[PDB]
Amino acid sequence: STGSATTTPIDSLDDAYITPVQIGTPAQTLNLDFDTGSSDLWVFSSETTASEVDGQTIYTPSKSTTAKLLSGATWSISYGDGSSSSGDVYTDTVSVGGLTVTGQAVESAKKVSSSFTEDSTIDGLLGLAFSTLNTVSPTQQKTFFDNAKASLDSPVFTADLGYHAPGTYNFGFIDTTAYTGSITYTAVSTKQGFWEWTSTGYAVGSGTFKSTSIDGIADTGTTLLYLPATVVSAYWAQVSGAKSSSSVGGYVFPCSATLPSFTFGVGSARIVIPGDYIDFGPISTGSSSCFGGIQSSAGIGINIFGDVALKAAFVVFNGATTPTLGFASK
């Protein structure tokens, strides 16, 4: 089997992407944030505290003839941005782009943090990291991909995120028309539960490539590119007037600037992020200070190849017995 679904930016900045997901019988379609940095499929629901729902579409398990409470199971998650959610668990039928999994754990939110409430466009998350990170207790549950894997034509999914445009998540096949050149594959460590890999270096603009190992994770659920302070300083030094602002929370730059590209290495291959992908717009409405899309990871503990980086590539998440990642230009 295969599946193919369009993923759409939630706003004009590409802050996140939503993909329609069919849950239950008859189908309830929710728009979920596919997140290769986490491993829970959780949804706004009829169980979510009413004051914490503000425009999201909810899953109502009592209206699904295939929903079953997973007795005793609870979940609770905290994300790298400080947001969180928790609740109980049903199993139900879940379909993405024509690919159906029966018995998928659907984690129903009883509580969500304010950032989720405040984003009416995201009805939940669909985690695509390794199932060892799933938070369901006392019996950890499998991701949608893990459950689908055996049925897929090939045990892979691909992320093709758009710049200010829709893109595609495919399951079970490589669309060889969706990228240019060849795909370069690179080793993955699953030791932390992430799609963790080592970039071979970077370049700023038309500058020389610096060969240096940068361990990080491929994370579709993180907007920006978070890299070591040395790398980030080297990038922003090429933008007149750019500075790190403690009050804003990162590097800012004059909105009148033209940003240089940023290149990262994948083996001997190179992925070029155009400068315009690094512009996240005014820090507040009407400001002439703009927020940078490349930020320091120094306070995170891990480097994160988020959407800024991934949307410059066609990315293969190869879930074979020994997982690997693939990157192609597009």
UniProtKB/Swiss-Prot annotation:
Organism superkingdom: Eukaryota
Biological-process GO terms, alphabetical: proteolysis
GO molecular function, one term: aspartic-type endopeptidase activity
Disulfide bonds: 255-290
Catalytic activity, as annotated: Hydrolysis of proteins with specificity similar to that of pepsin A, prefers hydrophobic residues at P1 and P1', but does not cleave 14-Ala-|-Leu-15 in the B chain of insulin or Z-Glu-Tyr. Clots milk
Documented EC number(s): 3.4.23.22
Keyword NADP: no
Peptidase A1 domain residues: 17-328
Active-site residue list: 35, 199
UniProt keyword terms in alphabetical order: Aspartyl protease, Disulfide bond, Hydrolase, Protease, Signal, Zymogen
Family membership noted in the UniProt record: Belongs to the peptidase A1 family.
Protein name (database record): Endothiapepsin
Organism: Cryphonectria parasitica (Chestnut blight fungus)
